[PDB]
Amino acid sequence: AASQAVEEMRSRVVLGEFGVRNVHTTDFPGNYSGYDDAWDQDRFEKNFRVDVVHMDENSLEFDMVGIDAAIANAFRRILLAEVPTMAVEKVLVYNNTSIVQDEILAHRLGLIPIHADPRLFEYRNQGDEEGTEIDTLQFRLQVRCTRN
Amino acid sequence: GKTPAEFAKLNECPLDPGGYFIVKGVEKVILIQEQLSKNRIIVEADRKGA
Amino acid sequence: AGILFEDIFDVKDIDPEGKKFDRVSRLHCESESFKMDLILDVNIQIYPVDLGDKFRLVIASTLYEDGTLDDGEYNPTDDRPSRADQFEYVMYGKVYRIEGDETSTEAATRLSAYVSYGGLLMRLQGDANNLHGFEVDSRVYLLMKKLA
Amino acid sequence: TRRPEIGDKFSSRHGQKGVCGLIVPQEDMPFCDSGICPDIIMNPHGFPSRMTVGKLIELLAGKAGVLDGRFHYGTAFGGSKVKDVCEDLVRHGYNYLGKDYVTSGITGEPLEAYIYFGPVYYQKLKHMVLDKMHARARGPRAVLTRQP
Amino acid sequence: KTALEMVQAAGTDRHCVTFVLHEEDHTLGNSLRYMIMKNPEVEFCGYTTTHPSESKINLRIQTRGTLPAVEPFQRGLNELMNVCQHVLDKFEASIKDYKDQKASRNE
Amino acid sequence: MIIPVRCFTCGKIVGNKWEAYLGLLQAEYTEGDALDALGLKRYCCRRMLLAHVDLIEKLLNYAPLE
Amino acid sequence: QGRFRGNLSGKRVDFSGRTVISPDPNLRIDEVAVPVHVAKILTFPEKVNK
Amino acid sequence: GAAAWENVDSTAESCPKCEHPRAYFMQLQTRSADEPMTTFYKCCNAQCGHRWR
Amino acid sequence: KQAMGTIGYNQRNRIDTLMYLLAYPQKPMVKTKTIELIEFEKLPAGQNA
Amino acid sequence: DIVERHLIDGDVVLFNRQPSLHKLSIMAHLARVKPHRTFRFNECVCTPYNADFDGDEMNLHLPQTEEAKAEALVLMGTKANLVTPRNGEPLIAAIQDFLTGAYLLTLKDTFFDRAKACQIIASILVGKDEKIKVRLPPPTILKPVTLWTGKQIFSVILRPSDDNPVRANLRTKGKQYCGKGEDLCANDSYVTIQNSELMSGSMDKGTLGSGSKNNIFYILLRDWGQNEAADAMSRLARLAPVYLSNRGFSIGIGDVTPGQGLLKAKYELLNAGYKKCDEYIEALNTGKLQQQPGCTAEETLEALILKELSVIRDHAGSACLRELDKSNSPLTMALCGSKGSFINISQM
Amino acid sequence: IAQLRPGQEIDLLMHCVKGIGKDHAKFSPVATASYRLLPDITLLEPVEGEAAEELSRCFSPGVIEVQEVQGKKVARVANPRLDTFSREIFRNEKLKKVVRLARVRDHYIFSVESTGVLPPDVLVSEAIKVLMGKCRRFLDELDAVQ
RNA sequence: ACAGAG
Numbered sequence A: 001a002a003s004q005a006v007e008e009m010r011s012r013v014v015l016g017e018f019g020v021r022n023v024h025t026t027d028f029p030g031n032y033s034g035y036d037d038a039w040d041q042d043r044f045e046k047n048f049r050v051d052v053v054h055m056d057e058n059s060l061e062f063d064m065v066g067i068d069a070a071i072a073n074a075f076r077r078i079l080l081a082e083v084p085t086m087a088v089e090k091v092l093v094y095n096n097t098s099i100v101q102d103e104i105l106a107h108r109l110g111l112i113p114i115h116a117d118p119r120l121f122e123y124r125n126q127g128d129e130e131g132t133e134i135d136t137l138q139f140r141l142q143v144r145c146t147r148n
Numbered sequence B: 001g002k003t004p005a006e007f008a009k010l011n012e013c014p015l016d017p018g019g020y021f022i023v024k025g026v027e028k029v030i031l032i033q034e035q036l037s038k039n040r041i042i043v044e045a046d047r048k049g050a
Numbered sequence C: 001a002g003i004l005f006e007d008i009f010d011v012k013d014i015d016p017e018g019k020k021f022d023r024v025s026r027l028h029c030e031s032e033s034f035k036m037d038l039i040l041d042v043n044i045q046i047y048p049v050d051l052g053d054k055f056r057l058v059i060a061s062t063l064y065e066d067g068t069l070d071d072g073e074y075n076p077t078d079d080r081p082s083r084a085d086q087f088e089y090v091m092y093g094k095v096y097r098i099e100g101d102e103t104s105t106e107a108a109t110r111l112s113a114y115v116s117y118g119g120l121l122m123r124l125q126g127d128a129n130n131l132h133g134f135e136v137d138s139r140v141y142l143l144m145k146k147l148a
Numbered sequence D: 001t002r003r004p005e006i007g008d009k010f011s012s013r014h015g016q017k018g019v020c021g022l023i024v025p026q027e028d029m030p031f032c033d034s035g036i037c038p039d040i041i042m043n044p045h046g047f048p049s050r051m052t053v054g055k056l057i058e059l060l061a062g063k064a065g066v067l068d069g070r071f072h073y074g075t076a077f078g079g080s081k082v083k084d085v086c087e088d089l090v091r092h093g094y095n096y097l098g099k100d101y102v103t104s105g106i107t108g109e110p111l112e113a114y115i116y117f118g119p120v121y122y123q124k125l126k127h128m129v130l131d132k133m134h135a136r137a138r139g140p141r142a143v144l145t146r147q148p
Numbered sequence E: 001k002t003a004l005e006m007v008q009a010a011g012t013d014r015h016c017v018t019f020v021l022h023e024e025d026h027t028l029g030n031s032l033r034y035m036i037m038k039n040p041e042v043e044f045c046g047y048t049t050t051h052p053s054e055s056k057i058n059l060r061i062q063t064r065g066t067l068p069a070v071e072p073f074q075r076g077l078n079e080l081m082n083v084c085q086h087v088l089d090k091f092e093a094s095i096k097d098y099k100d101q102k103a104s105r106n107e
Numbered sequence F: 001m002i003i004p005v006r007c008f009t010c011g012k013i014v015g016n017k018w019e020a021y022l023g024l025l026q027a028e029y030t031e032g033d034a035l036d037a038l039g040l041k042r043y044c045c046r047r048m049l050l051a052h053v054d055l056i057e058k059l060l061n062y063a064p065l066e
Numbered sequence G: 001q002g003r004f005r006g007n008l009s010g011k012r013v014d015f016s017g018r019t020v021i022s023p024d025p026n027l028r029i030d031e032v033a034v035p036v037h038v039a040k041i042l043t044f045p046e047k048v049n050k
Numbered sequence H: 001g002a003a004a005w006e007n008v009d010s011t012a013e014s015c016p017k018c019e020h021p022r023a024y025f026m027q028l029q030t031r032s033a034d035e036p037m038t039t040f041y042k043c044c045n046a047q048c049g050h051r052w053r
Numbered sequence I: 001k002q003a004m005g006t007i008g009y010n011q012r013n014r015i016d017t018l019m020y021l022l023a024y025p026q027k028p029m030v031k032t033k034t035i036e037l038i039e040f041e042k043l044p045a046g047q048n049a
Numbered sequence J: 001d002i003v004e005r006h007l008i009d010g011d012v013v014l015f016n017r018q019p020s021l022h023k024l025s026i027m028a029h030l031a032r033v034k035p036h037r038t039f040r041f042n043e044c045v046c047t048p049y050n051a052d053f054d055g056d057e058m059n060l061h062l063p064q065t066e067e068a069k070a071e072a073l074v075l076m077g078t079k080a081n082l083v084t085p086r087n088g089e090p091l092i093a094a095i096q097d098f099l100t101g102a103y104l105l106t107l108k109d110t111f112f113d114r115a116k117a118c119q120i121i122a123s124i125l126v127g128k129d130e131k132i133k134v135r136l137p138p139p140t141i142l143k144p145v146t147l148w149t150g151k152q153i154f155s156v157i158l159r160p161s162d163d164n165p166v167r168a169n170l171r172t173k174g175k176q177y178c179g180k181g182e183d184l185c186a187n188d189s190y191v192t193i194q195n196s197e198l199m200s201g202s203m204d205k206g207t208l209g210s211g212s213k214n215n216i217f218y219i220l221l222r223d224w225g226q227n228e229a230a231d232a233m234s235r236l237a238r239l240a241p242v243y244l245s246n247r248g249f250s251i252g253i254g255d256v257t258p259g260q261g262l263l264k265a266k267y268e269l270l271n272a273g274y275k276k277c278d279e280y281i282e283a284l285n286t287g288k289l290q291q292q293p294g295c296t297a298e299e300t301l302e303a304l305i306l307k308e309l310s311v312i313r314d315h316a317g318s319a320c321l322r323e324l325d326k327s328n329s330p331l332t333m334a335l336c337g338s339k340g341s342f343i344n345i346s347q348m
Numbered sequence K: 001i002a003q004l005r006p007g008q009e010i011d012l013l014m015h016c017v018k019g020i021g022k023d024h025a026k027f028s029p030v031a032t033a034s035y036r037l038l039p040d041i042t043l044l045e046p047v048e049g050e051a052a053e054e055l056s057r058c059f060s061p062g063v064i065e066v067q068e069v070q071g072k073k074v075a076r077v078a079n080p081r082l083d084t085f086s087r088e089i090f091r092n093e094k095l096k097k098v099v100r101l102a103r104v105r106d107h108y109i110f111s112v113e114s115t116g117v118l119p120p121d122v123l124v125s126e127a128i129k130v131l132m133g134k135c136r137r138f139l140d141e142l143d144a145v146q
Numbered sequence L: 001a002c003a004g005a006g
C-alpha cells in the first residue's frame, strides 16, 4: 500500500546497497496529507523517555526516545565544544635543561586533564595575567635527576 | 668499524650514509658524472645527412 | 468547473529503456473514450503504479471547484474543501510547449502538449478538439486516482 | 614552533599534494558510529583524472592493518592483496570495502552516500606560508638603477 | 555588546526579517530552526553562517499572514527552553533510578 | 620524539599507555592483543601506540651528562 | 639582463605583494581576500577633500 | 582507400557533433600538463568530417 | 625529499643553517621492503591521518 | 593633505599569476581584509589564472593613482572580462564540485520536503541578497506528500525574488543526449530553461561550466547585463556545497573494482586478440601478407596489430560501463564532465 | 611528560584556568561523545535450513540467533542493538531480498566517555543547561529591545 | 655559481 510507504518514509532510515535512503526529517505541518505535525507539548511529554543501559567510572551509555536529530546533535555539540573545564594555559619556566623543548613541554602540560570541578571557578578577565583565588589554580613541577 | 654506542661519543648518527666531505664546515658531495665511453668508433649522421 | 481535460487512461508500459531512476518511472498510457496517448512521470515511491492499471486523470486550471482562480501563493496548511479530496495523486506544473505533429504531410489534427512538473514531464498527444484551453505559459494541476 | 594553518602544504605519499584550505572544529566534522571524525577530509575529485588506485588501496590496507595490529606491505610488484584485507575488515565488524555509515555533524541527519574512512600517511612539506608572505610600500633601492 | 540585530527585508512590513544571532553557530541555529518550522504560521525558515571566520548566523523567518516574525522566533525560543527543561528532568530521574537499582543488587 | 599525551582524532589519553604497552610486549603478546588489553577500541587510538617510534630513548644517548 | 629588457620595458615595482593562495567560495567572483599583515603595509594615498 | 582509413578500432560510438556510428578515433596522453586525458575523433558516416577534442 | 621529519640521532647536537623537525613523527602503516632495507622507520617523516 | 591610509574594504587591487599567457592572467578585484595569511578568491576565477592551490604564489599590485584605479576597474574587472577575447567563450564559470553538486541537485530522483528546501534556499541569503524576499516556489507534488523537485531549488539561483527582472531562456542538448528524444529522452539530458524555471534536463559541464557557449551564465551575460551573470555564479558557489556536503559524495576501492561480467569478457577478448595477432605474425614471417596500400610488409603488420589490440580496449571498456551501477562516483564525475572521462574509468 | 638523564633538571609553574572547548581542544571534557540510531533488522521471509547459518555470519556475533523448533533450524533477530551494519548481507546473493536493514529515526543511543574531570552523567546534565542557557540569553534581548 | 617551487 502507499500508506505503508508514507509510514516508512517518515519513520525509518533504510540502508540500501548503494545509498542510505530517507535521510531527512519530514514531520512538519503541511508535509503530509492526513497527518497533523504541528507542535504539541503533550505528545512530546507522552512519548519521550530515557533508558540508561550501562554506566561505570568514566563511561555512560543511554537511550533517548522521541527527540529529533536537531536536538540530539545540539547535545553532542555542547558536550564537545561548550562544556567548560580547567586546563593549563600559562607555564612559567625556571631552568628547563631537559631535551624536550620548552614549547613542546608547555604543549604537553596543556593537555593533561585536571580534576578541578569547573562549577566553582570563574572566567579570568581580559588581561589580568596574575589571577586570584576565584579563577585559577597553580601546580608546581620540580624534578632533578641524579645517579643512583 | 665502530659500534653504535661508540658513535655516541663522536656525536654521529649510525645511519648517516657518509660518502661526503667536510670542507670549511659545509658538507659537499662529489656527484656521479656521466660520460661517453672513450676509445670507441661512433658511426653517426651529420647535420647534412652524410 | 475549471477542468481542462478528463479521461480514463490505461497503462501500457512502465519502463521502455529500463529503470533509469529509483523514484520516477516513465509511464506510457492510452485512453478509452478518445485516442490519447499519455507519457507521464510519477513518483513511484509515494504512489506505486503497476503494469495493467487503469486510472482517471483530470487536468484542472484551479483546485477549488467554484471556479475562483485565487492562487497568489499555495498554503498547504489550510484545510478547506478542494478538488483534491477526490483524488490520490496531485501535481502542479506549467504548460510550456504546444507543438504540431510532423507525422502527416497534409490534413492532420493531432497536437502535442508538454507540461513540465518541475522536471517530471508529460506529453499529452491526440485530437485538437480535446486539447482546447491549453495555452503556453499556463499553470495546471494534474489529478489522478486509480480505479478498480 | 609552527602550528599548521591556512596555506601550509601537506602531501599524501602518492603525488596527491595539496595546500590547506580550511580548518573546521571537531563538532562540524562528520562522525561515524564509533565516534571517529576524520582529521583530514580529502576531495574525491583528485582520483579519476590522476588514477591513483594506490592511495585507495593504501587506505584500505592501513585500516585493515591497525584493527589487528599488523603492517601490511605495499611492496612494488607484489604486496598484500585486496582479497586478504577485505577479509580482515569484515572480521572486525567493518564493511569489506571501508565505506562507513556516516552522520553529518552540521544537521545531525545521516549522509546518503557512504564515506571511505581510513588512515593515510600524510607527510608535511617545508613550504609554509609564514616564510612566503611578502609586501613592500616603499623601501631600499639599488644604487645603479634607482629602482627597488 | 549587542548580540541580537533585526534586519527587515526591503519591501515587507515586518513579516520578513533576518535575525543576526551573534556568537553562535549551527548548535542553536539548527535546533531553533527545527522548533520554528513546527509552527504552522511559518512559511519559510532557515539559517546560514555568514563566513567561517565570523561567529554569526543569519536566521530568516517569513510568516504567512500579516503577523510579524518576532512572535514565531519568541515561541521557538520558549518551546526549545521547555523541551530542554523536560529532557533534563527525565535524564536526571533515569540516572537516579539506575543508581538506585544498582545499589539494590549485590547486597 | 616522545609519545603524545592524547590521540589526535578523538582525544582519549593515550600517553600513559606506552610503558604498559612495552611491558605487555615483554610478556610476549601480539600487538593486536596488547592493544585490546589496554582498552583501545577505535583504530585512531590504536595507531598512536602501533606507529610510534621512541626517538627520545635514543636521542638521550647523545645528550650531555655529568 | 640589459637595460632595455631588464630595466626599461620591465622593472621592479613597489606597492606589491606575494603570498600562497587558497580557495574561498563565500566571496564573490570579483572580490579577493587580502591578509591584514599585507593590508597594513600597502597604502593608498587618499587626498583630503570635503 | 576508405578501408585503408577505417582499419582502426572504433565504430558505433557517439561524437558531440553529429552522433553518427561510422567513426575514426584517436587518444593521446603525451602532455602531463594535461592531467585530463586527450582524445580526437573523426566521424564520417554522412561524410560530415568533424575533428574536435 | 621535502617532507619534514628527523635527520638523525644527533639532531640536537647539530647546528645547521636551516633544520626542520616534526614533533611527533610516526612510522608508516603501509610500507615497502625498501623502507625496511634503508632503515627508514627508525627515523620517519610523517604522521598517520 | 594626503593621508596614506591602509588598504581597506573596496580598494581596486590588481592580481596576477606569474606565467602570463593571455590578458586575463591579470585582472582587478575589490579587496577585503580577513585575518589569515593567504590571498583568497572564489574558485570560479581559477580558470583564467590557471591556479590550482598546490603551493601556488600569486602577485598583487595596489595602484597609487585615481586614474590607475578607474582604468583598472572599468577595463580590467572580472565582471567585464567573463569571456575570453580569443573566441568569445566564457572562462569565469563553475568548476568541479560546483558542477557535480549541481548535477546531483538537478537529477530527476531528488525530492525535498519543505524543511530541507528552505534550508538549502536560505544559504544564499548573505551579502547583497540579505534584504531580498525569498520567493519559495509552489511545491510540485501536493496530495500524498509535499515535495519540491531539485530543479526548482536550482531555479531559485536564476530568480531569487519576485521583482528580479531576469528572464533566462536556454534550449540545448546535454552531454549524454541520445539523439532521438528532444525533450523526452530516456537519459533526461535535454535542457529547457524557460522564464528562469528549469523545465527539464540536468546541468552538465556544457551548461554551467567554463567550456563553451550555451552556458546559462553566458545567456545572462548577453541578455541581462554583467551583474546578473556575476550574482548567479555567487549564488551557485554558495548553494552547491551546501547540498553536496550534506548529501555526501565519496569514492572507494569498490568504485573501481571489476565485476564478474567484466572478468569473463576480458579473458575472451584477450584470447581472440592474441590469436589474431599470432596468425598475423605467422602470415608475415611464413608467406604472404595482404600488404596494405602505401606501406611495407612490416608496416602492414603494425597497423593490424594496433587494430586487434585497440579493439580489446573498446570491447573491454564498453563492457565495464554497462555493468557499473548509478551512484558510482567516477561514473557520476564523468557524466557531468566535472573531472575525468570514460577513458579513465575504462583504463583503471 | 619528559624523560631525563643525570644532571638535567625541570622546574616550572602552571596556571590552570577555565575555558570552553570551542576555544581550544584541551578544554573538552569528553573523549568522544556520539550517538547512533537504533537498528531494526527485519526478516521479510522465514529463513530456514543452512541459510540460517550463513545469515548469522553476515552480522555482528550476537544479533542473529539460530534456534530449533522441531529439530529444524529457524533464524530470528534477537538483539538488533549490537549490530554495527557491516552490510555483509549484500555480498550473499540469495539473502539480499529477505532483509530490510533500517534505523529507527527517533531512538538514539548516546555513548559519552569522560576524560576524568567529572563523571559523565554530570556532563550531560551540564550540557542541557547550556542549551537552556543560550535560549535564555536571546529571550533577554527580545525584552531589552521592546 | 648551484638547488628548489609553481
Ligand SMILES: [Zn+2]
Pocket (backbone or CB within 6 Å): F007, F008, F009, F010, F011, F012, F042, F043, F044, F045, F046
Ligand atoms: Zn583516538
Ligand SMILES: [Zn+2]
Pocket (backbone or CB within 6 Å): H015, H017, H018, H019, H042, H043, H048, H049, H050, H051
Ligand atoms: Zn563529427
